[PDB]
């Protein structure tokens, strides 16, 4: 994995030595070369994971998140340059450097062999994200949004740090390759109970948990577009990836301690969906949709069945691409109407027809239209939760009504009906914007043809 | 007037001075070459050749092989009267149960 970290580090002299108009083109070209290079991690085996060194390995779980992460840099560089055309050249290079630095921390968060290196990179991804949110955000409430994002996560993770050192003193190592083989059944006491809480609550914060999700609708509507893309598509999936790593060590106490957080998520996926019904703020609607989808990932990791893990990883990849496309659609309104109020700009199908078709495709994949891998992930999670308890289908099926009702209302409000009279700066869609929608959605539509590369360590 | 300040600029249309603009850059040669970089290294490199690369993966996690092995091993136990699957995975002669 040192053939991916060295070019990502080489992207810093690629962006600090470039000419004043070349700093987007060079980084986009070389980052697309890195993303096409990133398909070499499909050398996975049905028994052995692809294991590189003492410091890095990459199973079939970290591999699609890696391809998504190294693919998400050129899409952020495309999405985040029209609102930064008047910005100074030095801070423009700084914004590109922070995106490259965040990619550098993410690609060796997922390939972490030993879990305290996973922790160091897992909390290292805060710093460029925090600088992006508080510096290149657009409105007044970003500075408050720099605190709620930060001091929630650390408030779970500095206990989690302690927990990992305890395993370094008890099992003898924090390698995931060792702890597949030296894992011991964790009995019932209050000591092992707080061991479970210390292992799980930081990832519950970064999933987010229903109740601990207060950072998320404020950290998405106050970030810039590249920030909202990378918080929706990857940084919520650090929690799911970390839970899939860390629930190996937590048997069988998870089989009776995870019940309240399962209840929190199975009811939060109803309540945040009903919140998505009543959002005047479009980017807030997409953020609460991200909560309402990641609640099923929390449930599928805690019930720990193979259908649930494959459905959870498919829903993480598919929701990453879907929510990134939705935030770019919110940006493609907000760069023309200059307000995130969803009830302001109606009737955009009379003005932007192909962009309205992209709104249609993202609004259909958000409600998991088959055979997209949104529906594969959603479907396998619902199947495994019917296997878990036979009443839970109600809370799934009711959710799969309301998941339609904000996916179509955002489709109906922003596109259908009478257009707005006092607005006459609705420009045509740029080639940047439609290329952005195509690079978001067409990999998600091609993964319907071959989903067996994004289905976890136990396909 | 508190905190003396520039007038707020205009939300500029790139299509006024450049109706052939793609939206990447106001200088048209750099703009159209950025379009060429995006479309070539985004579609003529990553989607098409990458989808060809993912299309012909060499048996991703042995989904072909484990079928074909099964199409031998069922043959190994349809012929000679062996059951198709035991209820035991490991050999019960080499397991030491705890006595009671």
């Amino acid at each position: 994995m040192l053939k991916y970290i060295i070019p990502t580090m080489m992207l810093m002299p690629l962006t600090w030595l470039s000419k004043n108009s070349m700093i987007w083109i060079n980084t986009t070209l070389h980052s697309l070369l890195i993303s096409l290079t990133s398909l070499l991690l499909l050398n996975q085996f049905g028994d052995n994971s692809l294991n590189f060194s003492l410091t890095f390995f990459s199973d079939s779980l970290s591999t699609p998140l890696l391809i998504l992460t190294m693919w998400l840099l050129p899409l952020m560089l495309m999405a985040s340059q029209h609102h930064l055309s008047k910005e100074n050249l030095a801070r423009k290079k700084l914004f590109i450097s922070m995106l490259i630095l965040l990619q550098l921390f993410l690609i060796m968060t997922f390939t972490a062999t030993e879990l305290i290196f996973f922790y160091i990179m897992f909390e290292a991804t805060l710093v460029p994200t925090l600088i992006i949110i508080t510096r290149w955000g657009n409105q007044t409430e970003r500075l408050n949004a720099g605190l709620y994002f930060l001091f929630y996560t650390l408030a779970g993770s500095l206990p989690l740090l302690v927990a990992l050192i305890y395993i370094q003193n008890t099992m003898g190592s924090l390698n995931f390759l060792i702890l597949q083989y030296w894992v011991q059944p964790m009995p019932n006491s209050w000591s092992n109970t707080f061991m479970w809480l210390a292992c799980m609550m930081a990832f519950m914060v970064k999933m987010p948990l229903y109740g601990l999700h207060l950072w998320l609708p404020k950290a998405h509507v106050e970030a810039p577009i590249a920030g909202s893309m990378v918080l929706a598509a990857i940084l919520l999936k650090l929690g799911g990836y970390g839970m899939m790593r860390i629930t190996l060590l937590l048997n069988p106490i998870t089989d009776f301690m995870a019940y309240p957080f399962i209840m929190l998520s199975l009811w939060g996926m109803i309540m945040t969906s009903s919140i998505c019904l009543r959002q005047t703020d479009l980017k807030s609607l997409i953020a609460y949709s991200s909560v309402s989808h990641m609640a099923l990932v929390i449930v599928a990791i805690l019930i720990q069945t193979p259908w649930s893990y494959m459905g959870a990883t498919a829903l993480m990849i598919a929701h990453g691409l879907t929510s990134s496309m939705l935030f770019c659609l919110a940006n493609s309104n907000y760069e023309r109407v200059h307000s995130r109020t969803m009830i302001l700009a109606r009737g955009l199908q009379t003005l932007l027809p192909l962009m309205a078709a992209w709104w249609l495709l993202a609004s259909l994949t958000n409600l998991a239209l088959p055979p997209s891998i949104n529906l594969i992930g959603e479907l396998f999670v619902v199947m495994s939760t019917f296997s878990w308890s036979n009443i839970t289908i109600i809370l799934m099926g009711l959710n799969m009504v309301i998941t339609a009702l904000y996916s179509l209302y955002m489709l109906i409000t922003t596109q259908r009906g009478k257009h707005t009279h006092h607005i006459n700066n609705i420009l045509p869609s740029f080639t940047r914007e439609n290329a952005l929608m195509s690079l978001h959605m067409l990999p998600l539509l091609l993964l319907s043809l071959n989903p067996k590369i994004i289905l976890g360590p136990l396909y | 007037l508190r905190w003396q300040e520039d007038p707020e600029p205009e939300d500029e249309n790139l299509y006024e001075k450049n109706p052939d603009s793609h939206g990447y850059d106001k200088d048209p040669a750099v703009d159209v070459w950025n379009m060429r970089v995006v479309f070539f290294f985004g579609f003529s490199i990553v989607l098409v050749l990458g989808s060809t690369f993912v299309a012909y993966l060499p048996d991703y996690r042995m989904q072909e092989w484990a079928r074909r092995e099964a199409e031998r091993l069922v043959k190994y136990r349809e012929a000679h009267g062996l059951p198709l699957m035991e209820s035991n995975c490991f050999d019960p002669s080499k397991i030491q149960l705890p006595e009671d």
Partner: peptide, 19 residues
């Protein structure tokens, strides 16, 4: 419509003897 940066009213919170 542009980016918000702090004004005098926001900056007078950081100017007293205490916070």
């Amino acid at each position: 419509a542009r980016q918000w940066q702090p004004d005098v009213e926001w900056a007078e919170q950081y100017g007293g003897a205490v916070m």
